[PDB]
């Protein structure tokens, strides 16, 4: 009656394996309430525009 | 019997909280801006111009054959799955810039912006004239291919003489990958409406410039051709020019501003009327990074039509025009000998090359459709290929029949057993050319790892697990 | 599929599935006039200048009603459009007739009459072209047929014989059923037959009927049809007496036999010099429709449909109704003449006056329609479909939108050059099969009113029902 | 406007014209609504309002 | 306010109104066709059947 013909069965498996999962820096790098200023004296450069 | 009045997808398509990210690696294309280079037949350098439609046909993996760990959230006896587009980003890689197009032999007689004196006419008054086109950005997204409009040659109701004006008709077509956008000379079939072959620049002189039919695309019943769109376009008239040729329609001899007849009889030089067939050269002014449509995520919360972003058939069409990165790079090669110490024009071969760069990224939400009798009838009336693609309809009508299987098929003591007839006949969109992008092996559930994915997570709140 | 009961194997009355409501509407024609020539269409240059209009014709009016499935009564949602459909039922009809009573005669200038045999003085002969100008008054007939489908008429036509026959042989008769159209001739006392095919003489009956088919309504078929759609009720009133007894000239196709002793024709009159060859025994009578009276009139009276004759109790399926009227009681041909363009002669001359002939009919049709509701269940749906598929298709009930869409591209100047075609040559969708038939098409779409007492038939209906309008003072 | 000295073959259509559309609405007094007896025709009349 | 006229408003329309035997019903008396805007040309749009 109804035959049992074989077929190429396509199945997707995502993700294939759990790998690495790169995380945010907020997970392991703990902030502190200590802040520092840093600045450059004054950066000048004089030259020729073309060559 | 079944229903009338097309309903929203939000009534029979039930969402889940499962979101997947899918993106293209990087899509580059290099070609000639104006015309394809062939030898004589095979394309050696394709036409890649910054004024083409980029119509990407995205292929999704069938979500019904996804091996989920616990599938207990859906029943494959009574339910089927579909993808719904929730986020998208159209990345654009090149710098901003404006490229120009021209014709070596353009049908332009003079400049009529300001004439210092009255003019003349001979044979072949064609000039080498270039222009920057109208600036255009657009993006359309849908599950069907976009509809474009243009003006074309129709058949008249009676016969005409040789050289008579061709009658216009508004012709709807699918917009394909490599079709030309409107550039400020209108949406028209240049191949048929201008037999001169010199009336518009080289990249459009034989093409059909099409515009997206927004009026028909929003007013279709299901809303499948587009469920989101953005557009920006700007043009001004840069120079004002005249045509050359036999004047097909003369100016009427009566002057309606003064209510009188007029002729330049008193002035011998102006008796022959100068051409009253004018055209402007377009110009899309200053391009800016502030005005940019692309390189921005778009979240498709509420679609324009009844299709709320449902990617029926596992297909999606992304239609992009970006006349803001149309910088044609001028290449040169030193031919003959790499030894001369003096510049000659015959020693160098000039070339033109255009390079486009795209990157496409999407966020797809899984949705479940429970296929009750009325839902089945509604989906079948909307689109039969949905219930053909998803195994459920077409319950098996005939019974078995003997085929008699003649043992020695290549013998001359029996009749011929040849049959084996059918080549595969599936694709209804095979006659159309698209930038086919395959995302079947590009779906991922790890949204945090991808730039659009983490943008979606930030927008929805939903921080990654620690 | 399809639970018990199985498909109903007998016709049922419309009273079993058509639910009548108490909502009644009047509808009327304003006044329908037609002016023509009684005997033949006056043709000039391949066109009809003056058409044939005669009182011996079938007047088949095709009445078009408004679609009730798109109407607004003094209610908002009194019918479910997912499960119910609405239809009109005719409950009262009046056929008004405007002209005075009277009888019109007709004739042939070259009638096939050899002699008079009512009272012949003595025996005589037959030469070449023995035709005479003979006029007659036809049979008086009045009839009225009402149905939702067009009337069926019968007549005797030419059959195909089983083998060949020689030149001049008698054509074999066959009874032909054919729909009655507007302008068909009613029988006038010469029988219901095809005069063009059965009488190649073209000279054997009067001018109006000489080249046409005379039909009689097939009452035997119309009352015995299964659903009863072509006949709700009828009236008929016919009268004839034979006025004069005449003979026909021509070759005797079948001679009298030489048998039979007691009749003078058949005993060979060889002894008599004059009687040797028999006079033509192809007798014919002239009909006469006697005195037209005002008492005997079918028309100008209201007819109330209590019960129709068949299973269709007055239901106007498809939103149509057919009214077939014949009356040869107002068939007075008006004899109008004109002078030569200069009426400067002061004396009479027969070449100075051009005589013409006209006939004018006048009709006015008033109707009372009742709304009815059909609740279309599985079995009612199957029964309506098996009776007539066009009824259940022409209102879209069990149909979804097809996946293609129905966006029409309509041009604003459909006569201009350069737009391909008029675009609508092929008549694919919703063409009634009555495309081939000519009727007096009457549009009553804009003529329906609920204000019954205002109209003459509507206040007759109110008197008959015992109702009066509620007082305004 | 293009004429063969006489009849209009090609009308004048420019973008610098007034397009004055005269829209015709159906008579609401003669209409079929979900229900119709919500206004008395002897003391009331209907009209459309643009929204 | 209209008892509509005190006289009849029945207009008898002829059949075959192009012929030279019923001379003449062609446009000669006006009727309630008096649009006050009939001297003016607009782009007509019928929406009677588009509601």
For residue D50, count CB atoms less than 10 angstroms from its CB and return exposed for 0-12, middle for 13-18, buried for 19 or more.
exposed
Nearest to A15 among B62, B396, B444 (CB): B444
Q: How many residues does chain B have?
A: 466
Burial label, C397 (beta-carbon count in 10 A; 0-12, 13-18, 19+) = middle
- Cα B230 to Cα B22, B98, B136, B319, distances in angstroms: 22, 21, 11, 11
How far apart are alpha carbons E17 and B236 in whole angstroms?
58
3-state secondary structure chain B: CCCCCCCCHHHCCEEEEEEEEEECCCEEEEEECCCCEECCCCEEECECCCCECEEEEEECCCHHHECCCCCCCCCCCCEEEEEEEEEEEEEECCCCECCCEEEEEECCCCECCCCCCCCCCCCCCCEEEEECCCEEEEEEEECCCCEEEEEEECCCCCCCCCCCCCCEEEEEEECCCCCEECCCCCCEEHHHHCCCCCCCCCCCCCCEEEEECHHHHHHCCCCCCCCEEEEEEECEEEEEEECCCCCCCCCCCEECCCCEECCCCCCHHHCCCCCCCEEEEEECCCCCCCCCCCCCEEECCCCCCCCCCEEHHHEEEEEEEECCECCCEEEEEECCCCCCCCCCHHHEEEEEEEEEEEEEEEEEEEEEEECCHHHHHHHHHHCHHHHHHCCCCCCCCCCCCCCCCCCCCCCCCCCCCCCCCCCCCCCCCCCCCCEEEECCCCEECCHHHCHHHHHHHHHHCCCCCC
Inter-chain residue contact A12 with B449, CB threshold 8 Å: no
Q: Which residues of C touch E19 (CB under 8 A)?
A: 49
| Cα–Cα distance, B221 to B217 (Å, whole number) | 9
Distance CA E10, CA E29 (A): 15
Asked whether the beta carbons of residue C75 and residue D32 sit closer than 8 angstroms, the reply is no
Whether E10 and C33 lie within 8 Å, measured CB to CB: no
Distance from CA of D27 to the nearest CA of B (A): 25
Nearest to C184, CA basis, from C154, C214, C140: C214
Signed CA dihedral, B250, B256, B261, B267: sign only: negative
Q: Rounded to whole angstroms, how far apart are CA atoms B144 and C362?
A: 63
Min Cα–Cα distance to chain E from D23, Å: 5
Question: Residues of E with CB below 8 A from C51's CB?
Answer: 16
Q: Which residues of C touch B1 (CB under 8 A)?
A: 397-400
Question: Dihedrals φ, ψ of B453, to 5°?
Answer: -55, -50
Rg (CA), chain B: 29
CA distance C292 to C238: 11
Task: Give the pair of three-digit tokens for residue C129.
Answer: 């072209």
List beta partners, residue C177: C154
Which residues from chain A sit within 8 angstroms of residue B65, using beta carbons? Answer: 10-12
Nearest CA in chain A to B66: A12
| Nearest Cα residue to C417 out of D5, B188, B154 | B154
Q: Shortest CB distance from E44 goes to which of D22, D25, D26?
A: D22
Confirm or reject contact between B445 and chain A (CB < 8 A). Answer: yes
Q: Cα torsion at C384, C390, C396, C399 (round to 10°)? A: 80
Chain B positions touching chain D (beta carbons under 8 Å): 165, 249, 252
Could you tell me how many CB contacts below 8 A there are between chain B and chain D?
4
Nearest CA in chain C to D42: C472
Contacting residues for C424 by C-beta, under 8 A, at least 6 apart: none
Convert B72-109 to b/e letters by CB count within 10 Å (16 or more is b).
Answer: eebeeeeebbbbbbbbbbbbbebeeebbebbbeebbbb
Half-sphere exposure of residue B266: CA atoms within 13 angstroms, side-chain side? 1
Residue positions counted in chain D: 51
Can you read off the two tokens belonging to residue C121? 């003085």
The rounded distance, in Å, linking the Cα atoms of C450 and D37 is 13
Interface residue of B6, B157, B225, B305 to substitute, partner C, most C CBs within 10 Å: B157
The tokens of B308 are what? Answer: 């709320």
Q: Report how far residue C205's alpha carbon sits from residue D37's, in angstroms, rounded to the nearest whole number.
A: 62
Q: What is the dihedral of CA B139, B144, B147, B153, to 10 degrees?
A: 140
Using alpha carbons, list the distances in angstroms from residue B373 to B307, B378, B395, B396, C397: 20, 9, 14, 18, 18
The answer to whether B134 touches B262, Cβ cutoff 8 Å, is no
Name the residue among A13, A21, A22 with its Cβ closest to that of B67. Answer: A13
Rounded to whole angstroms, the maximal C-alpha distance in chain E is 43
What does the DSSP assignment read for C138-174? Answer: --EEEEEEEESS--EEEEEEEPPPSS---TTPPPPEE
**Which residues on C lie below 8 Å from E12 (Cβ)?**
30-31, 33
- The distance between the two most distant Cα atoms of chain A, rounded to a whole number of Å, is 91
Which residues lie across from B278 on neighbouring strands? Answer: B242
A11/B65 CB distance under 8 A:
yes
CB contact under 8 A, C70 and D35: no
Helix (H) and strand (E) counts in chain E: 0, 1
CA distance C406 to B149: 19
How many whole angstroms separate alpha carbon B83 and alpha carbon B60? 8
Distance CA B88, CA B450 (A): 12
Q: Which two tokens stand for residue C302?
A: 């209201």
Nearest to C145, CA basis, from C45, C271, C235, C218? C235
Q: C58, C182 in Cβ contact below 8 A?
A: yes
Closest by Cβ to C50, choosing from E10, E14, E21: E21
Residue C462 preceded by cis peptide, ω within 30? no
Chain C residues with beta carbon closer than 8 angstroms to that of D35:
75-78
Residues in chain B closer than 8 A to D3 (CB atoms): 252
Report how far residue B173's alpha carbon sits from residue C423's, in angstroms, rounded to the nearest whole number: 20
CA dist., res. B50 & res. B180, Å (int):
9
Residues 6+ apart with CB under 8 A from C156: C173, C174, C175, C176, C191, C192, C193, C194, C198
- What distance in Å separates the CA atoms of residue A14 and residue C117, rounded to the nearest whole number? 112
Task: Indicate the SS3 state at residue C19.
Answer: strand
Residue that has been written with the tokens 């949602």 in this structure:
C77
Give the 3-state secondary structure of chain A: CCCCCCCCCCCECCCCCCCCCCCCHHHCCCCCCCCCCCCCCCCCCCCCCCC
Strands B54-59, B315-322: pairing kind: antiparallel
What is the Rg, in whole angstroms, of the alpha carbon atoms belonging to chain E? 17
Residue pointed to by tokens 């036409």: B47
Q: Check if the beta carbon of residue C151 is closer than 8 Å to that of residue C322.
A: yes
List the single residue in B1, B154, B384 with the smallest CB-CB distance to C418: B154
Alpha-carbon radius of gyration of chain A: 31
Does B20 sit within 8 Å of A12, measured CB to CB?
Answer: no
Run of H or E residues at C60 = strand C59-64
Instruction: Please indicate whether, in this complex, the C-beta atoms of C49 and E21 are within 8 angstroms of each other.
Output: yes
Contact in structure between C444 and C367 (CB atoms under 8 Å): yes
CB contact under 8 A, C418 and B2: no
Using the structure block, give the residue that is written with the tokens 């760069």. B357
| Coil, strand or helix at E19 | coil
* Pairing of the two strands B435-438 and B54-59: parallel
Two tokens at B39? Answer: 């030898």
Which of B65, B396, B449 is nearest residue A10 as measured by Cβ atoms?
B65
E45 to each of B113, C11, C407, D47, E34, how far by Cα in Å? 40, 50, 18, 18, 18
CA distance linking residue B44 with residue B46, whole number of Å: 7
Chain-chain contact of D26 with E49 (C-beta, under 8 angstroms): yes
State how far residue E48 is from chain C, nearest Cα, in angstroms: 14
Contacts with C72 from chain D: Cβ below 8 Å: 31-33, 36
Say how many CA atoms lie within 13 Å of B311 toward its Cβ.
27
Give the single-character DSSP code of C447. -
Interface of B with A in 56-115 (CB under 8 A): 61-62, 65-67
Are B378 and B28 spatial neighbours (Cβ–Cβ below 8 Å)? no
Tell me, yes or no, whether chains B and E touch by having 3 or more C-beta pairs under 8 A: no
Residue-wise burial string across C45-59, b where 16 or more C-beta atoms lie within 10 A, e elsewhere? eeeeebbbbbbbbbb
Do strands B180-181 and B209-212 pair parallel, antiparallel, or not at all (unpaired)? parallel
Give residues with Cβ within 8 angstroms of C120, minimum separation 6: none
Q: CA-nearest residue of chain D to C68? A: D32
- Answer yes or no: do B20 and A14 touch at CB < 8 A: yes
Total residues belonging to chain A = 51
Query: Of C130, C420, C30, which is closest to residue B158 (Cα–Cα)?
Result: C420
Measure in Å the smallest separation between the Cα of B91 and chain A Cα atoms.
23
Bridge partners for C369 per DSSP: C25, C90
Q: Give me the residues paired with residue B231 across strands.
A: B138
8 Å CB contact between B294 and B90: yes
Residue carrying structure tokens 């009644």: C24
Residue C383, classed as helix, strand or coil, is helix
Report which of B204, B143, B142 is spatially closest to residue B179, judged by C-alpha positions.
B204
Method: cryo-EM
Distance CA B287, CA B135 (A): 8
Which residue from B226, B206, B208 is spatially nearest to B218, judged by alpha carbons? B226
Chain C residue nearest residue D33, CA to CA: C72
Would an 8 Å CB–CB cutoff place A11 in contact with chain B?
Answer: yes
Q: Which residues of B touch A13 (CB under 8 A)?
A: 67
Q: How far apart are CA D27 and CA C176, in angstroms?
A: 51
Nearest residue to B14 (alpha-carbon basis) of B372, B368, B375: B368
CB-based burial of residue A27 (10 Å sphere; 0-12 exposed, 13-18 middle, 19+ buried)? exposed
B443 touches chain A (CB under 8 A): yes
Least Cα distance to B320 among B111, B137, B118 occurs for: B137
Give B 285-324 residues with CB within 8 A of chain A.
none
Closest approach of D11 to chain B, Cα-based (Å): 13
**Dihedral pair phi/psi, residue B451, rounded to 5°:** -60, -45
Q: State in Å, rounded, how far the first CA of chain C is from the last one.
A: 61
Where is C392: in which H helix or E strand? helix C389-394
Tell me the CA distances in angstroms from C286 to B268, B290, C219, C243, one per residue in order: 94, 104, 26, 5
Alpha-carbon span C25 to C367, nearest angstrom: 8
Distance, CA of C146 to CA of C149 (rounded, Å):
9
**From chain C, which residues contact E within 8 Å (Cβ)?**
30-31, 33-35, 49-51
SS3 at position C458: helix
User: Best residue in D4, D19, D35, D44 to probe C by mutation, most C CBs within 10 Å?
Assistant: D35
| Among C464, C470, C469, C466, residue whose Cα is nearest residue C453 | C469
Task: List the beta bridge partners of residue B281.
Answer: B239
Task: Mutate one of B65, B394, B446, B454 to test the A interface: name it (highest A CB count within 10 A).
Answer: B446
Closest CA to C64 of C268, C369, C330, C360: C369
Contacts of E37 in chain D (CB under 8 A): 22
What count of CB pairs under 8 Å joins B to C? 44
Long-range pairs for B116-123: beta carbons < 8 A, 24 or more residues apart: B118/B269, B118/B270, B118/B274, B119/B274, B121/B244, B121/B272
- Looking at residue C191, what DSSP letter applies? -
CA–CA separation, B83 and B62 (whole Å): 9
Distance of CA B162 to the CA centre of its chain: 35
Question: Is B466 exposed, middle or buried (CB count within 10 Å of its CB: 0-12, 13-18, 19+)?
Answer: exposed
Q: What does the alpha-carbon distance between residue B27 and residue A15 come to, in Å, rounded to a whole number? A: 24
Q: Three-state secondary structure along chain D? A: CEECCCCEEECCCCCCCCCCEEEECCCHHHCCCCCCCCCCCCCCCCCCCCC
Interface contact D3-B252, CB threshold 8 A: yes
Are the C-beta atoms of residues C299 and C95 closer than 8 Å to each other?
yes
Cβ separation E43–D20 shorter than 8 A: yes
Q: Are strands B147-153 and B135-142 parallel, antiparallel or unpaired?
A: unpaired
Omega of the bond leading into E24 within 30 degrees of 0 (cis): yes
Under 8 Å CB-to-CB from C448, ≥6 apart: which residues?
Answer: C25, C26, C27, C65, C66, C369
Q: Which residues of E15-50 are buried (b: 16+ CB within 10 A; e: fewer)?
A: eeeeeeeeeeeeeeeeeeeeeeeeeeeeeeeeeeee
| Break-preceding residues in chain A (C–N over 2.5 Å) | none
DSSP 8-state assignment for residue C299: S
The span from the CA of B51 to the CA of B55, in Å, is: 13
Angstrom distance (rounded) from CA C225 to CA C152: 11
Residue E43 neighbours by CB under 8 Å, 6+ apart: D19, D20, D21, D22
Q: How far apart are CA B57 and CA B311, in angstroms?
A: 12
């Amino acid at each position: 009656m109804a035959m049992w013909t074989p077929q190429t069965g396509k199945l997707y498996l995502p993700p294939t394996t759990p790998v690495a999962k790169v995380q945010s820096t907020d997970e392991y790098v703990y902030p502190t309430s200590l802040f520092c200023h840093a600045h450059t004296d004054r950066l000048l450069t004089v030259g020729h525009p073309f060559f | 019997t079944p229903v009338a009045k097309v309903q929203s997808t939000d009534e029979y398509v039930y969402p889940t909280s499962l979101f997947c990210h899918a993106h293209t690696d990087r899509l580059l294309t290099v070609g000639h801006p104006f015309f394809s280079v062939i030898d004589n037949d095979k394309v050696t350098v394709p036409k890649v111009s910054g004024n083409q439609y980029r119509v990407f046909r995205l292929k999704f993996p069938d979500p019904n054959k996804f091996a989920l760990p616990q599938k207990d959230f859906y029943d494959p006896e009574k339910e089927r799955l579909v993808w719904r587009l929730r986020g998208l980003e159209i990345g654009r890689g090149g710098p901003l810039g404006i490229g120009t197009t021209g014709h070596p032999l353009f049908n332009k007689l003079g400049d009529t912006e300001n004439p210092n004196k009255y003019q003349q006419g001979s044979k072949d008054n064609r000039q080498n004239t270039s222009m920057d086109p109208k600036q255009t950005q657009l993006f359309i997204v849908g599950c069907e291919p976009p509809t474009g409009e243009h003006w074309d040659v129709a058949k008249p109701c009676g016969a005409l003489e040789k050289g008579d004006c061709p009658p216009i008709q508004l012709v709807n077509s699918v917009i394909e990958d490599g079709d030309m956008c409107d550039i400020g000379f209108g949406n028209m079939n240049f191949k048929e409406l201008q037999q001169d072959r010199s009336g518009v620049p080289l990249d459009i002189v034989s093409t059909r410039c099409k515009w997206p039919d927004f009026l028909k695309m929003t007013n279709e019943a299901y809303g499948d051709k587009m469920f989101f769109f953005g557009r920006r376009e700007q043009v001004y008239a840069r120079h004002f020019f005249t045509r050359n040729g036999s004047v097909g329609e003369p100016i009427p001899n009566s002057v309606s501003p003064s209510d009188f007849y007029y002729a330049p009889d008193s002035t011998q030089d102006q008796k022959t009327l100068a051409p009253s067939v004018y055209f402007g050269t377009p110009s899309g002014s200053l391009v800016s990074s502030d005005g940019q449509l692309f390189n921005r995520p778009f979240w498709l919360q509420r679609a324009q039509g009844n299709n709320n972003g449902v990617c029926w058939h596992n297909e999606l069409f992304v239609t992009v025009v970006d006349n803001t990165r149309n910088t044609n790079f001028t290449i040169s090669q030193q031919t003959n000998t790499p030894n001369p110490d003096t510049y000659d024009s015959t020693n160098f071969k000039n070339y033109l090359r255009h390079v486009e760069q795209f990157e496409l990224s999407l966020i797809a939400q899984l949705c479940k459709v429970p296929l009750d009798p009325g839902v089945l009838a509604h989906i079948n009336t909307m689109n039969p290929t949905i219930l053909e693609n998803w195994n459920l309809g077409f319950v098996p009508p005939p019974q078995q029949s003997i085929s008699d299987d003649y043992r020695y098929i290549t013998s001359s003591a029996t009749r011929c057993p040849d049959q084996n007839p059918p080549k595969e006949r599936e694709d209804p969109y095979k006659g159309l050319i698209f930038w086919e992008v395959d995302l079947t092996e590009r779906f991922s559930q790890d949204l945090d790892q991808f730039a659009l994915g983490r943008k979606f997570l930030y927008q929805a709140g939903i921080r990654t697990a620690v």
